[PDB]
């Protein structure tokens, strides 16, 4: 009986460690003997340790996660795809947590419960990746969302943080209800919720004249929920406001971790499933709308966080183009784009968190940064040129596949939209380089140097960005491996 739980050793460990950290934090934060010490950094270090130990347990026991698969079948399904997705998610959580210690210390955010909620949302995303049924998928999504709603309002005395929390809660509950309606429609039409049963019932018919309208609308409503989750237009307007209003570590965590978990969910619910190109048209049109709106709105922005939010919207559009084309290379390029965007976003948010010690708010605040910190200005410029897609930087892969799929799938309007949006994006990205290098403002802002954690992470991500294309084979091979694990 005990050995059946080898399939869930990582989750058992991380949940138990989170419980331990909760008890430790509550017991010693209320202690008069120790003068009620802030424990955000202590619990943060212990939780980074817990995340790393979970990653070791998951990575080392690669075959053991598939043990007792018949017994666990009606709860989840673990395979190669979920294995690598979960490893990536844990690494992203670890990097995000490592970027939080200066924020805890200098801002004096003393709440250790922030770390505990991040850990619980990580457990939720772990369960999302391995979900293989609509019920499990919904429950894990909801655990994740509730943790995010709480942490987005963590600065409970701030107008911005409370506003972001309120908008987040209302719109997220709305979208979750829509998705649950879709699940109910599918269940009523097919009498099934397991992904295998859904795969069998739907395969071979798609829209054959006598089309189950219940299955169609279930797919539609579930897709609307997923598109809300990935910040895709027109279900996107929550994301810029929430990203801006939340505390910057919260924004950093939301811009990376939840995308990996929900794209895993999207690939396992639909690609593994079967319906007409209708859903592919849904993601195609949403990708086009996302690129256009993201580009223009980012061009309009004067603040750094809002610009990064709209940039992320544009890039999810670029990524969803790979889902729409419905090929093995489409899934491979989607995974590659998600990986590269995650690394680039962590680079950018390490820079933003480093500059937030001096309260960077506007793009104009970066004036004369090439003088006051030359190495930092170059690192941010490498990231911005990677964002713009200029070769030989790592960001060029997304542009390359966007145009490759279009000229193959036969699309030319898509190629035109990609060209125009790429040029607009290049403009509003190089505006930041112009501000740091070309302008000569009357008043300068001198920024406090960053801590060791952010500098190490920045150095590693900058080396990856400048040099990934010299030796890119492991990423290509591992993404190809994952793409095939979905079908065979």
């Amino acid at each position: 009986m005990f050995n059946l739980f080898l399939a869930v050793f990582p989750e058992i460990f991380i949940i138990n460690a989170t419980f331990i950290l909760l008890i430790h934090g509550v017991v010693f934060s209320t202690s008069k003997k120790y003068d009620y010490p802030p424990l955000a950094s202590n619990v943060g270090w212990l939780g980074l340790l817990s995340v790393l130990i979970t990653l070791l347990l998951l990575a080392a026991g690669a075959p053991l996660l598939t043990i007792a698969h018949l017994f666990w079948n009606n709860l989840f399904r673990r395979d190669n795809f979920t294995y690598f997705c979960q490893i990536f998610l844990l690494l992203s959580t670890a990097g995000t947590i490592s970027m939080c210690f200066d924020f805890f210390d200098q801002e004096r955010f003393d709440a250790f419960e922030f770390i505990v909620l991040i850990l619980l949302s990580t457990c939720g995303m772990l369960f999302m990746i391995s979900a293989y049924d609509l019920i499990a998928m919904y429950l894990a999504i909801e655990l994740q969302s509730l943790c995010f709603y709480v942490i987005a309002a963590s600065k409970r005395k701030s107008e911005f943080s409370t506003e972001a929390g309120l908008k987040y809660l209302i719109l997220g509950a709305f979208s979750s209800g829509i998705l649950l309606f879709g699940c109910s429609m599918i269940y009523g039409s097919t009498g099934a919720t397991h992904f295998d049963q859904l795969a069998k019932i739907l395969t071979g018919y798609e829209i054959t004249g006598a089309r189950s309208s219940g299955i169609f609308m279930g797919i539609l409503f579930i897709a609307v929920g997923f598109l809300f989750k990935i910040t895709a237009v027109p279900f996107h307007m929550w994301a810029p406001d929430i990203y801006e209003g939340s505390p910057t570590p919260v924004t950093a965590f939301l811009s990376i971790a939840p995308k990996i978990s929900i794209f895993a969910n999207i690939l396992r619910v639909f690609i593994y499933g079967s319906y007409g190109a209708t859903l592919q048209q849904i993601f195609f049109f949403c990708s086009i709308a996302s690129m256009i709106l993201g580009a223009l709105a980012a061009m309009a922005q004067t603040k750094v966080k809002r610009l990064l939010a709209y940039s992320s919207i544009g890039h999810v559009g670029y990524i969803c183009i790979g889902f729409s084309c419905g090929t093995i290379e489409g899934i491979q390029s989607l995974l590659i784009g998600i990986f590269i965007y995650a690394l680039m976003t962590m680079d950018a948010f390490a820079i933003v968190l480093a500059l937030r010690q001096t309260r960077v708010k506007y793009i104009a605040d970066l004036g004369a940064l090439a003088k006051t910190n030359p190495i930092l200005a170059i690192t941010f410029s490498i990231t911005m040129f990677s964002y713009a897609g200029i070769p030989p930087l790592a960001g060029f892969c997304s542009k390359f596949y966007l145009f490759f799929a279009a000229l193959g799938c036969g699309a030319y309007f898509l190629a035109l939209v990609g060209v125009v949006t790429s040029v607009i994006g290049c403009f509003y990205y190089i505006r930041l380089v112009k501000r740091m290098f070309f302008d000569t403002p009357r008043t300068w802002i001198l920024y406090e140097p960053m801590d060791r954690n952010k500098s190490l992470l920045l150095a590693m991500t900058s080396f990856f960005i400048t040099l990934f294309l010299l030796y890119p084979s492991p990423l290509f091979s591992v993404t190809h491996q994952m793409a095939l694990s979905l079908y065979l």
């Binding site: 934060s29 209320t30 802030p38 210390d105 200098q106 801002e107 004096r108 955010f109 003393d110 600065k155």
Partner: protein, 56 residues
């Protein structure tokens, strides 16, 4: 002004280290989490200057 300077310059190594730690501990604040905890953190007297040297 002579009084505060004479007080600071005559402190021993142990007192210098104690006040360095205190200065670090009270440099910033999180009054919101203090209110959640139901406590009020007060600046220790060794870190408060006499009123006769303040601009007011």
């Amino acid at each position: 002004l002579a009084q505060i300077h004479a007080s600071e310059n005559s402190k021993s190594f142990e007192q210098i280290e104690v006040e360095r730690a205190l200065r670090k501990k009270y440099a910033r604040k999180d009054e919101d989490y203090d209110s959640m905890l139901g406590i009020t953190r007060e600046t220790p007297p060794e870190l408060i200057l006499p009123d006769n040297v303040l601009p007011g």
